[PDB]
């Protein structure tokens, strides 16, 4: 099955975490916990923003450009990224914006973290409608010493 995992400010705004105006270690731990031991598919700018392969995961980079690191797998299309994952129970797509667009129609599961912030940006997670997605998990948290904003984890399943 294919799943997307993303952190969304209000209005589904997304971005690179190292430039988002928040500190959310709890969400980063949520991400790691839900991606560990699974293939992760990411776009090139997401690759560059991370700066290193994610340990304990097969890293696949979807780009039209030739590869620049043998520690990860470089593919040129959505179908190739999927094929490169081989035979696994769950494929995690980790952005960014265009990658989320491309994979959403093939996905059965969403792991969303909603962040209580208004942040300007021209990139958004694609529209997911209640008609198509059943929310099967939600877990609300408030800001604290480590975490700058209210954040809510949500898992949805395609109806």
């Amino acid at each position: 099955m294919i799943s997307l995992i993303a952190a969304l400010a209000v209005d589904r705004v997304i971005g690179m975490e190292n430039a988002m105006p928040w500190n959310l270690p709890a969400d980063l731990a949520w991400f790691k916990r839900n991606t560990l031991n699974k293939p992760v598919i990411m776009g090139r700018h997401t690759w560059e923003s991370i700066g290193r392969p994610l340990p304990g995961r097969k890293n696949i980079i979807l780009s039209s450009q030739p590869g620049t690191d043998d520690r990860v797998t470089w593919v040129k299309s959505v179908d190739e990224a999927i094929a490169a994952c081989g035979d696994v129970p769950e494929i995690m797509v980790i952005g960014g914006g265009r990658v989320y667009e491309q994979f959403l129609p093939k996905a059965q599961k969403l792991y969303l973290t909603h962040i209580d912030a208004e942040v300007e940006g021209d990139t958004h997670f694609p529209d997911y409608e209640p008609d198509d997605w059943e929310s099967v998990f939600s877990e609300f948290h408030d800001a604290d010493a480590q975490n700058s904003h209210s954040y809510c984890f949500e898992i949805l399943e395609r109806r």
Partner: nanobody
Amino acid sequence: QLQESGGGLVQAGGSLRLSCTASGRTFSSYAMGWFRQTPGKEREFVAAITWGGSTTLYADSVKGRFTMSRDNAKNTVYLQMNSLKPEDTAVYYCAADGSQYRSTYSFRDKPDYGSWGQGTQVTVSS
């Protein structure tokens, strides 16, 4: 499933505090807003706040006089109204966003309501 309270008579220059309490487990995934309507006139946007309470938006007519706040543990939003004046006189209503996790701007500029309060009359003397 919204219920306002507070309101009634206040002297000009005075303060009034409104609250809006909700029933329902999904309250804290929605933006909330305050509106005001006088008989036979337009309903007017007053304030909005995001789902988690951190971010607010106000009409220029109430900016710096009114504050909206939120307490998700109590499923409640509040409107603190200071420096009140006669033309603030109106029925005040709270409304829940019909769409989850939107900005204050989207709540105001792309209307979609899931729920409205019964309204509470606010009356400012002169």
